Design a protein around this ligand. Structure first.
Ligand code: AMP
Ligand code: AMP
Ligand code: MG
Ligand code: MG
Lengths: 595, 594
């Protein structure tokens, strides 16, 4: 049955494995965020047994872990056991959360919805366990950008409830989840110019842009659909839409717009897209050189509804143009090879009645918008391949690091390999901060690596307009881009590197490379220190600022990521409050300290 | 197919949908005293009124006839909208934004309520594309399900009444009653450690499910379980709304599917039609077989339409108790009253979600089903069935369906009304006065048995979850004592005044008067005669008749729309219905001085 087929990945054996992996990560990351304080229990062999108890005291979780730099808890999956009233019990993620509800600060309101997000994340793991199990070495050897993108399993390495996609029924999961590599056809709407606005970056004009993307034949067909209803194509702008968004939302929530002819259904476009790790961003699988399309998707994932703001679209291209120009202008960013793939164009729809009915923060203002982003594909030479930076912290079904496999392929020492990666990825971030007070959101999903023979040649940053900030409230910026100017205490500025790079990315990378015996934490962090010191030696003009915002400070604040989602799982940061949802809980030892 | 699904959404149908809904909004919100129209005298022969927005800048203008029970027959074709001196299109979303403060819609509720408005309008657009049958063709047809799927209005008080929120447009087309789309149920095997089946008198499980599905189907179901390593003895069968399977059970209850607490058995062979309640299915393949009522986590008219696993245990016993009571009472026998029983019920208890929520949680209403016997086997040659909701049906010409039953009968409007009141309304007087027992007897909970256009007898449904005994000291069989309630004495007769008079007869007497069929005076005269004739026939309750006075000058105006507007997600709250009631002054009882 297509009934039975749709749940064939939900079996006791895979459910067990899924629960073991998720509970392993719960113990590790909730210990990192100091929600749990595991108690040391009597010397087993040497490298350490621990116990975590329920709110109750009645249910015990025992495991082994190696504790690594940045208060990182490498909890052994195979070691986790559960005990109550003298007896062992099966590992069960739902029971974990009910049992540690108060320990974890889960409100009565959030718990039941959080458990849906857990339930959904576990299903996805079960789905991923049914797929062909490719080693880290096979995936590296493939050189296949979309094989890597869709082969990723973890998601965000910190958030536990990270792959919820709540709003997807099972059939929609199987059609739309990145890990399915299901081909998707975008739904195209005509949107009346009384309510839709198209914004073009330098070098973009609308009529040639849409003809390049859809082909002149499809544009002609769409013009015919409007003439057919007695409508003038000049009156309308083209908006591509996530099929989920069209069938579940715009046809109901925006029925008035469809009925009135403010919105007209044109059809599917021909090209087959693959959802990326972000879910609502599509890569063009038929024409890899064409643009990604970022769609409005009113689905809950990882602390936010994944809509797209019609208001932010107006400035989105200008912000990208400014960033690209700043990068071509800077000698250090040139040495580095840094580029972005620009958000090149954007369209937004202003639902006039919903604006009248909602504050400017409502998800109802984020139901209909899209932007186009350049493919990195046309920029690579022969011999080059592309990969999500997320791949560096990927471990295959045998625990083998994809970073490890790139090191193997490269023929370089681990530390030589790391120098090339850090020069490409990390040095731009240090220089953007010190020279321009510029920060990004540089996790695994927002960076693409260009690889030659297993070596990182250069990094490509994406997700620009909605993520970048300038940490100077009086920054002189072109009018259209000054909304990126933020006021942030001095106190918290360098947390952009310590939190987003060190605690939420390097911590996982150094640990996977240590556990697999490829390179010691000592040599990992020496290498970061050295590249850091060499960057600073090459720009003496910024000496004063290197001392003021010290990368080698003894300590910096623990910023907790799960704590945000546990306090509020629908908007885990108020996008309307002065960066002040951060949950800082004491300090971490800086691995760079004394270098 | 993309264009096919939105083909009902056109400017002309959307315009007509908005006109109808703003007409009803002006009407019912005026009835509930949220609006106070001003009289702009055209003559002094009455006629013409204005309502302003919260800011006073936008003016709504119409004509109405005010009838008994403060019923505002707002003429749909008269409604105009004006701002800064210019005419504007009637747009329902704009109506609600403009009167947000007047209507008491919170910042939190407004945007979700507007979705329910948008969805209600969409439905109207879709009903406007169906073959426009007249009340006379529908009444002549004798087709139970042509009538059921032929209704357009929905609840005649509630404006945001047909939202079905959580249906995507594809789901609207497959699942909404007005589509008459055949549905196949999805069958799950539910492990006995979490599922419990309960049977009324005369039901045993194994013969029951073979009767419903056939021996071959049950055998195949046993085959899917043995194929998987599982013993069929360990499992019960639960039928599920495919929406609930595809969107909720396969995701929210993923742990149950994966562990084999729930096993997917496939679709059932028989075709069902969604009834007006949306999650109750009539068996179109075998009309004589059971209705299936399903758990459906969608928002409609002030509630989620899930089904409580906890209430299923007592459902059949409450049904058996009411049937036996009806069978034993001479006044209820003379009336011809019967119920269609909720005969069987299964409930799933999700133990982890129990640990995580309080007993009121919708997480506990996600997997449960009951079976309700069909009325079809009980009818004789010459008899047809119709939802009581049809009496207040008006076709595309404004012609009352009740009117068309009167014409077919050859009876005077008044003779016709006696038969209807005897079958439907007397049993409600006798239940209150003799047993302190009330139902929820709106159009969707009553089926009429029809001979030659006449109401011969009435059949009640929605039983276990609706009925009350208004007496906390009632001695009732152990299983059925949860229907015992403490209601203040001064609110008891609101069961008749609110649910029958203000929420049904108000509409029926106005439709009949406006079409010129029979006057309000003669309508309410007949009601008063049948009330008096009931009371005369049972003199031992003379003292309860003076204590609960059906002919009192006045009773409280109980506002239905005010509840949905205060809370569109659970409009009646915790375990205290007598709690959320919004009483705003009084209505002139049309039985006053009779
Ligand atoms: N490895 C990953 N790192 C970060 N985000 C990820 C990753 N894999 C998937 N995601 C998802 O991508 C989205 C990130 O959005 P943004 O933070 O704007 O880049 C969220 O929905 C994340 O759950
Ligand atoms: N004419 C009608 N009268 C009452 N309820 C109706 C009508 N048409 C549809 N319904 C729906 O039927 C359901 C009534 O549920 P209940 O009150 O428990 O029988 C609601 O979801 C109503 O919106
Ligand atoms: Mg992103
Ligand atoms: Mg009902």
């Amino acid at each position: 049955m297509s009934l039975a087929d749709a749940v064939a990945h939900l079996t006791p054996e895979r459910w067990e494995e899924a629960n073991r992996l998720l509970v392993r990560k719960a113990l590790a990351e909730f210990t990192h965020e100091r929600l749990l304080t595991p108690e040391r229990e009597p010397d087993d062999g040497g490298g350490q047994t621990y116990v975590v108890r329920s709110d109750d005291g009645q249910t015990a979780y025992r495991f082994t872990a190696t504790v690594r730099a940045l208060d990182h808890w490498q909890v052994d999956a195979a070691s986790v056991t559960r005990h109550r009233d003298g007896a062992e019990l099966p590992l069960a993620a739902l029971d974990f959360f009910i049992e540690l509800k108060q320990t974890l600060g889960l409100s009565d309101e959030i718990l039941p919805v959080y458990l849906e997000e857990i339930s959904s994340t576990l299903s996805g793991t079960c789905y991923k366990l049914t797929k062909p199990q490719l080693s880290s070495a096979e995936l590296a050897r493939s050189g296949d950008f979309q094989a890597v993108e869709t082969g990723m399993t973890e998601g965000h390495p910190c958030f536990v409830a990270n792959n919820g996609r709540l709003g997807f029924g099972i059939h929609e999961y199987l059609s739309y989840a990145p890990e399915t590599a299901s081909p998707v056809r975008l739904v195209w709407l005509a949107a009346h110019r009384s309510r839709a606005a198209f914004t073009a970056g330098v070098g973009i004009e609308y009529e040639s842009f849409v003809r390049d993307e859809l082909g002149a034949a499809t544009v002609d067909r769409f013009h015919g659909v409007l003439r057919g209803r007695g409508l003038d194509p000049a009156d309308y702008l083209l908006i591509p839409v996530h099929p989920w968004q069209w069938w579940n939302k715009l046809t109901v929530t925006f029925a008035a717009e469809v009925a009135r002819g403010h919105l007209v259904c044109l059809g599917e476009g021909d090209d087959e897209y693959l959802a990326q790790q972000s879910i609502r961003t599509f890569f063009n699988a038929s024409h890899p050189g064409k643009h990604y399309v970022k769609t409005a998707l009113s689905v809950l994932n990882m602390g936010f509804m994944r809509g797209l703001s019609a208001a932010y679209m107006e400035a989105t291209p200008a912000i990208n143009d400014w960033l690209a120009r700043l990068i071509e202008g800077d000698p250090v960013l040139k040495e580095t090879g840094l580029s972005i793939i620009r958000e090149r164009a954007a369209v937004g729809y202003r639902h006039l009645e919903y604006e009248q009915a909602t504050d400017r923060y409502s998800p109802y203002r984020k139901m209909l918008a899209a932007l186009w982003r350049e493919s990195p594909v046309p920029s690579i030479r022969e011999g080059e391949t592309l990969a999500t930076m997320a791949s560096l912290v990927h471990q295959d079904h045998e625990g083998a690091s994809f970073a490890g496999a790139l090191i193997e392929r490269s023929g370089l020492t681990p530390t030589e390999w790391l120098r090339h990666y850090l020069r490409a990825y990390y040095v731009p971030l240090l220089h953007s901060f010190y020279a321009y007070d510029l920060v990004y959101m540089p996790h695994g999903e927002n960076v693409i690596l260009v690889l030659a023979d297993g070596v990182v040649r250069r990094a490509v940053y994406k997700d620009i307009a909605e993520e970048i900030a300038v940490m100077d409230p009086d920054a002189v910026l072109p009018p259209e881009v000054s909304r990126i100017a933020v006021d942030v205490p001095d106190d918290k500025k360098l947390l952009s590197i310590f939190t987003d790079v060190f605690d939420c990315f390097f911590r996982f990378l150094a640990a996977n490379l240590a556990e697999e015996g490829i390179v010691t934490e000592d040599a990992f962090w020496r290498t970061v220190a050295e590249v850091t010191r060499e960057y600073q030696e090459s720009v003496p003009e910024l000496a004063d600022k290197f001392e003021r915002y010290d990368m080698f400070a003894p300590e910096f604040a623990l910023s907790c990521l799960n704590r945000l989602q546990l306090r509020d799982n629908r908007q885990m940061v108020d996008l309307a409050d002065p960066s002040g949802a951060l949950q800082l809980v004491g300090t971490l030892k800086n691995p760079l300290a004394g270098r």
